[PDB]
Amino acid sequence: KVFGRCELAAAMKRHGLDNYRGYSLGNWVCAAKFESNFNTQATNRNTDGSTDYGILQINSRWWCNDGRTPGSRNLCNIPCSALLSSDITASVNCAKKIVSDGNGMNAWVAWRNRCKGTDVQAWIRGCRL
Numbered sequence: 001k002v003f004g005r006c007e008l009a010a011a012m013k014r015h016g017l018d019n020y021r022g023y024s025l026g027n028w029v030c031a032a033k034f035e036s037n038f039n040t041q042a043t044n045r046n047t048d049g050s051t052d053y054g055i056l057q058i059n060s061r062w063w064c065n066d067g068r069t070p071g072s073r074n075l076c077n078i079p080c081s082a083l084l085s086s087d088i089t090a091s092v093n094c095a096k097k098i099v100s101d102g103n104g105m106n107a108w109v110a111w112r113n114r115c116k117g118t119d120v121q122a123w124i125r126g127c128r129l
C-alpha cells in the first residue's frame with residue numbers, strides 16, 4: 001500500500017505515535033516520507049547484508065527475522081515480512097521499541113539528515129487530525 005500523507009498521519013496518531021517519547025507527529029510522517037516514500041512494500045539492502053523493511057525501513061540486523069541475516073537479533077519478535085503489510089500496526093509497535101532504545105529518532109538516518117532541525121509540522125499541515 002502507498003499511503004496518502006494525511007491518511008498515514010491519521011493512522012500513526014491512532015496508534016499512539018503523536019508525541020511518543022516527545023516526537024511530534026510531523027517527525028514520524030517526515031521520516032516515513034524519506035525512508036519509504038510512504039510505501040509499505042519498500043525494501044533496501046544494507047552493506048552488511050541486512051535489509052530494511054517497510055514504511056519505516058526497519059533493519060533485520062536488530063529488529064526482525066528475515067531468514068538471511070545470520071548472527072542478527074529479532075528484538076521486535078516478528079518476521080520482517082510482517083513489516084510490509086498494508087496494516088502498519090507491526091511497524092508502529094516495533095518503531096516504538098526502537099525510538100525507546102536510547103538514541104531516539106536518530107536511529108533513522110533519513111530523519112537525522114532530512115527531518116531533524118526542519119519545520120516538521122509542515123508534513124501534517126492541512127490534515128484533519
Ligand code: NA
Nearest residue numbers: 060064072073
Ligand atoms: Na534479525
